Amino acid sequence: MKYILVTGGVISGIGKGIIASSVGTILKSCGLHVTSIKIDPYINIDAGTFSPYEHGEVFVLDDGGEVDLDLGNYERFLDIRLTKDNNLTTGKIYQYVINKERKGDYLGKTVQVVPHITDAIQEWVMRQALIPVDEDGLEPQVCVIELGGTVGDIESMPFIEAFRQFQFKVKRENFCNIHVSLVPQPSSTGEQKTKPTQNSVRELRGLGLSPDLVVCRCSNPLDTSVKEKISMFCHVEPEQVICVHDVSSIYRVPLLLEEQGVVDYFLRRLDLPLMKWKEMADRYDRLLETCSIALVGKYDSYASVIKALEHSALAINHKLEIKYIDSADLEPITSQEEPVRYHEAWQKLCSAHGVLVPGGFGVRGTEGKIQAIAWARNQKKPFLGVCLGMQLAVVEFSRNVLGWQDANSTEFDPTTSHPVVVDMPEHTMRLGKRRTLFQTKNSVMRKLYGDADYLEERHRHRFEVNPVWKKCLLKFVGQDVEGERMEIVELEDHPFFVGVQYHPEFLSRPIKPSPPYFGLLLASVGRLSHYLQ
Amino acid sequence: MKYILVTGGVISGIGKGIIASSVGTILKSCGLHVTSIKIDPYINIDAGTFSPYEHGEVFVLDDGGEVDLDLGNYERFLDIRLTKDNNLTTGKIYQYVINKERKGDYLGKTVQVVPHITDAIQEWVMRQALIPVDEDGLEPQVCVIELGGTVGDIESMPFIEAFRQFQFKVKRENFCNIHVSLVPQPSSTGEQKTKPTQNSVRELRGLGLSPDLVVCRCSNPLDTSVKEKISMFCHVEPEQVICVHDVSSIYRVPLLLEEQGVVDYFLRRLDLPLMKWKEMADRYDRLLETCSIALVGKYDSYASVIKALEHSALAINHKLEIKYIDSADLEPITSQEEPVRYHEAWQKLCSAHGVLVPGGFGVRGTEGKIQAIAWARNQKKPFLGVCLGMQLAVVEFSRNVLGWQDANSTEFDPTTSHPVVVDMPEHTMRLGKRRTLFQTKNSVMRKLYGDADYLEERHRHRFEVNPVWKKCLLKFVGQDVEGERMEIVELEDHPFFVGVQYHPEFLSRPIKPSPPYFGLLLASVGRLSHYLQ
Amino acid sequence: MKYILVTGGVISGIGKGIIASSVGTILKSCGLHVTSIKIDPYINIDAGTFSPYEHGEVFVLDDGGEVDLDLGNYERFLDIRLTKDNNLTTGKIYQYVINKERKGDYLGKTVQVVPHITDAIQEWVMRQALIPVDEDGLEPQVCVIELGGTVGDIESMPFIEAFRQFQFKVKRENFCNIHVSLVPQPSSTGEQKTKPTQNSVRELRGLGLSPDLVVCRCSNPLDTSVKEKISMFCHVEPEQVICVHDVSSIYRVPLLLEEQGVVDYFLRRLDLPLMKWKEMADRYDRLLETCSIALVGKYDSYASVIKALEHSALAINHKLEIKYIDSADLEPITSQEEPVRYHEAWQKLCSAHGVLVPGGFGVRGTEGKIQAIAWARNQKKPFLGVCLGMQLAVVEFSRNVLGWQDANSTEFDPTTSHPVVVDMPEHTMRLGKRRTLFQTKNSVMRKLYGDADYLEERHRHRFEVNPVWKKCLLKFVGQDVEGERMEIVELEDHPFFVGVQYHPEFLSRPIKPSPPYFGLLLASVGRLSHYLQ
């Protein structure tokens, strides 16, 4: 193959996944088919168990892989569709080796981290690099592998040991390594402190990996002296020391790496055979008009959602002002303890141009989301409900229009006489890519989806709308292939009141915002009336 | 509790398991109930898959735990009966944490080696320390934990990190640490080189453990200067620097540790409330007569077997000269390529005073073991067959006495018309402690077992004697509680020709040799005729 | 240049200096001019302060460099003459950098170990590699650099960091690295334990050096499996894994490395443009006759002396049986406490074929050396006194022949009325290469020195023979160019009673034993009478 490893140096959060994604879009702009792998040094088999305050926004792949948000960054910088196993973990690789041991496949020998786990990592990286994850069935010409976390933590050591072997298993023309470090600039000092980068690259070389590129996460751009000091103490050429500094938009991060010569480097270094990103950045920096959108949440947990709104905003040509609202502040209980939280949350929601009610589980914020959907009905503010927001729209309709004031989910109040959304597992979770059929032409949503008869979108839910109560209910315009499951709902006599049972955000790209997020943004600025025209 | 960790320094093989066992017998001689745990930094769930050339002699516990030979050293130095989970491994602890993660028991948080695996290790060590593994149901007053391998290998790091926490979770009076190092004395140098011990203890302190005792595996005793240099560079008191040197018998190893003051140290250091070992050593060193016993093997793989013979030898008051014979050298095929191997193997077998035919699996040495049992029949040399040796005695009888010249196992020749031993799994492997009933009084074996109606012994086999052919066959004196399975066989008109289907060696102690190994040793020196009298 | 670094792995003493010397003689046999450097990670500026029980036998170079014995191994395997600075130390390099800092030569910047000390090491290694230390003024084509001690000790870290830079300063064709490890084979285990080699090479790679060759100091030869395991865990080709095992003579160590293919490796690896050692080994292994030589010492401290005797032995074609005698056991004081030591020491001295009385300082053994020279006079056993042994021969003559029974040195009894050897510093120590003139033809020593008018030999003393008492004294056949200092003495009417004030051993080679050591060996077997004939 051709491999680029991307290792983290000093801390997480420093945009290493944006660097990996930017390097992938740079390679793709060179005419290469490109795949990507995230290694997460946790013991978890997939992210499908995280409370979103830790490793927030589990991104759901077509196969039902509940993976880290960086896999979603890969799908948005590169036109790819990944599999579960593009998220590698210690849980997955140790369980693989343990099951393979119990099978007797290791032939009655000792099994131990070196070699056998570090072999298994290389086997995995070889497998997932061959898979044509790109928008055509042609084999990837390069694979960008990101090692999550910081090097020299106990969990990251097996993977660096595997890559230390890998660079001699495949030849050096087939394996490059980027180190993404931090160069802090303290309030206490004003200097750009290279010391952590030196010690991190010293540690990485102790684990037997050189940086071929040293990418410094700077705030403000590096001085020449600091770049030279990094080049010296990392024992690498200045041309291979990159600063990624603070820039006006995400769209400039590939352009900065381009300017920094990484394209030219990888072309020679791997012996290989962004004008839109200029436009997207320059377009963003000249958006004079604005749209204000309420996001009524519970939980970074809405990373894909925020990005989908920003794609939609860039496409309508407005700035976006996301009014982040805790849905538990909108609940009347908060007015008893902290009326300041209540009245700030309701000033936010009421001044919005439209509302977004994203997915989740558990009782927190449920009556607040039902009230934010109520506000969307009676004030006629444009509404999108995503996954849970759809279910709560059936609840809010039922309570006010049908007078079923008790009505709820079987999750939140199982004692209710009108369970209008019920537990309905797959005959497991409705998890991954399902096909929804549009049951009609009387849908703005169908027209936003290009007037297509069907769409295929990633779901992540156990509950569905009750088919008994459906007869009384609120036009369920999108339904599954079985007709068992309601997957898009649209309310009559409203500018834009849509529930989608799936997660549109997972298939939003800058070049193609998801049509429910686009329709919401278009509706909130009135421009939907010109779009459908 | 009270805990003593025992860590390995420079290499394996240096008798760390003998030190742990000796420290346990020293503690037991202080009137303490004592348990023990082996940690093996391999990914294997139990040893029940090893080809015995790697981590040789899988010792089978009462519960069917196929564990490392050091668990068997614990059962022979201390009057204890262990469980599977007294052998801890990375495979067991990672699989525990992974299953616990998949259960959601880690409450949707990240799971990672520190803390969660290092917690799980401490939980395990707390559980297995409370279990009364001793010959009475009273709780262990101290637990000797052995860490297998050398410290600062990638697999041993989680366990040392766990013990680094543990010493502050329980108080320092509850946790002591011994480091077992090597002090090499090269042919190239003649000096006792302390440098590896210094660097090993430097490394161990980098992992946050001090040696409370430094045990030097010496060849020849340490000089004063070398002990002082070790005390200096390990930064510990000379009284806490121990030499375990080469000694005439295993029985002197507790006595050397006693002389070295470890008893007195542990009494004060853990705030706690060997005369037989003098006798056993002094007895061994005055055995003027000898017995020569053939061990016809395939595979250290016979560690328990060799020890059981040596207990039996010490009890009859003879030295033992074990004629180690590869059973594939006795096969006529070896006479075509290497007649030197054949004739040396047959000089060994024929000059023996008795023969032992120990357990195993696969076709290697099977016709050689059948011929060594044939030699035992026709020359009337005393024979014990253990596990497989019993099955091959039914085969050898069938071939010569019944004229069923084809006869074999369903393992070795499944096409045979007389499958006299057949695959007969438990309605799994017959693995662990089963009760055998003696079906008669016409057994020397019953009388060696104290004239008891039953015995309980550890088995490890899938195959059993065919109950159809049994009617023609060779007195099956020991049978299971169901009468389905033949578990001891005894041939008439022979001094001592016994097959046992179990492994007697696993329940041999110096103070009580297993009666089939004792009866064999007694028979080979003729003394059985005085014993049964 | 071309550089070969030789690093130590597990312990010292394992013959790393013999490997460096053997590699140098192999390179020299390829027609290359070769120099060598020893780095000793001690804080001492030269070895000229060590009590010879620590880093024994300070070897004195032509310039007066009191250096480690490995510099003397270089001069005996390779026809070279080294300078002080071929022994590099932390004391020398830190003092260099400190003086250079105090000079302001570092231009008011910070000075710190990396870069500035690690620069200074490379500067030193560049300087000393250019010096034609060979027997002709032609520049060295390769430099073998030995790093003393074990890698990953705090003192060795600057040097490995320097070589980690050096391999990228000069190109990889100019820099190769050998790792000399130990593979122990314990009495406790019988296996050849590769684990320390794995961990040592793991540590070395953490410091950023690969072994290009892994040299295993074996006792018995490596098995194939152990070599393969080393090749695997050191991540290097089997052809580059060398065993140096126990062999019958020093002369076979280059031949074993030759057989192991290191010549062929270095030729390709460094892109470069032993039949006598067959002969010397095969000659040694067929010496049927023997010579027994008394070495009367105080203090490995006599390494050069023992080697010089063995060159002389090989040249006369006898084995050598060196009777190592502590000169303090010969003193009558020892007969009062330990008559066993006295009578064993005097059985040794009296049964010898000749005696050697080597250099030293301080009062220990002085009356014993005077008595061993007395025994040489009155029994007519052949005597060589080296440095101090000469001075004590003037004392022993004075006491018995002149009746000056008080007589001694000003070192040992400054109150004496006949100070026959006196403190006589250079108008400092008489240290390094001085020219001695033979004052006559009435000398066997002159004839052994080829009948030359002068010789040039390395001295290391402050005391000299008193020119007042000289008039009464014992033919001082060798004197300095000034006539001030007596440098060789020869007693009349004796087979061979010679004192030399210098150290002949420092210029002994296998191909050319030093003539006083050769004359002594010839005398002790009577063969001198045929040699001078």
Ligand SMILES: CCOc1cncc(-c2ccc(C(=O)NC3(c4csc(NS(=O)(=O)C5CC5)n4)CC3)nc2)n1
């Ligand atoms: C090493 C990184 O260094 C630096 C340095 N300076 C700045 C940033 C930076 C990081 C994140 C963001 C960000 O999140 N911006 C938003 C957005 C819109 S679209 C999208 N991402 S996306 O959908 O994958 C699409 C690209 C393919 N993000 C509005 C929400 N904006 C700037 N990153």
Ligand SMILES: CCOc1cncc(-c2ccc(C(=O)NC3(c4csc(NS(=O)(=O)C5CC5)n4)CC3)nc2)n1
């Ligand atoms: C740190 C250890 O240092 C040293 C230093 N010097 C020597 C030994 C040494 C090691 C093993 C052996 C050995 O195996 N000997 C035999 C035997 C009989 S009984 C038994 N062990 S046993 O059944 O557990 C019983 C005790 C409870 N072993 C004959 C086979 N003999 C000596 N160990």
Ligand SMILES: CCOc1cncc(-c2ccc(C(=O)NC3(c4csc(NS(=O)(=O)C5CC5)n4)CC3)nc2)n1
């Ligand atoms: C990695 C080394 O591995 C092994 C493996 N096996 C054996 C040896 C070994 C080491 C030292 C000795 C030794 O010292 N022998 C003597 C001698 C005579 S000449 C001389 N050395 S010398 O003068 O420099 C001359 C050569 C240029 N030494 C008699 C005193 N003999 C064998 N070394």
Ligand SMILES: O=c1ccn([C@@H]2O[C@H](COP(=O)(O)OP(=O)(O)OP(=O)(O)O)[C@@H](O)[C@H]2O)c(=O)[nH]1
């Ligand atoms: O308080 C003091 C005094 C002196 N020094 C000396 O300064 C040297 C540099 O220590 P720094 O922490 O300044 O590191 P650096 O220059 O490599 O990296 P940044 O500043 O960009 O973070 C050290 O190696 C030590 O000799 C200190 O570190 N701190």
Ligand SMILES: O=c1ccn([C@@H]2O[C@H](COP(=O)(O)OP(=O)(O)OP(=O)(O)O)[C@@H](O)[C@H]2O)c(=O)[nH]1
């Ligand atoms: O007590 C035990 C049990 C098990 N093990 C397991 O054995 C593995 C090998 O540990 P060794 O110390 O046997 O190392 P090695 O085979 O690489 O080298 P030598 O024997 O030649 O010195 C370890 O990684 C661990 O899983 C032990 O080390 N020790």
Ligand SMILES: O=c1ccn([C@@H]2O[C@H](COP(=O)(O)OP(=O)(O)OP(=O)(O)O)[C@@H](O)[C@H]2O)c(=O)[nH]1
């Ligand atoms: O070749 C040489 C020359 C000098 N030295 C110097 O010797 C010092 C001691 O290095 P050693 O390896 O002799 O260690 P030690 O004395 O602590 O332990 P053992 O001998 O008992 O194994 C080192 O710290 C270094 O300064 C060497 O190690 N090797």
Ligand SMILES: NC(=O)CC[C@H](N)C(=O)O
């Ligand atoms: N993805 C979500 O928003 C989940 C919604 C709801 N808890 C369900 O399981 O259907």
Ligand SMILES: NC(=O)CC[C@H](N)C(=O)O
């Ligand atoms: N424990 C053994 O000796 C095994 C014997 C035989 N292979 C069986 O499985 O019964």
Ligand SMILES: NC(=O)CC[C@H](N)C(=O)O
């Ligand atoms: N080199 C030696 O043997 C020293 C001899 C004596 N102590 C002197 O200084 O002259």
Ligand SMILES: [Mg+2]
């Ligand atoms: Mg600084």
Ligand SMILES: [Mg+2]
């Ligand atoms: Mg030492």
Ligand SMILES: [Mg+2]
């Ligand atoms: Mg091993």
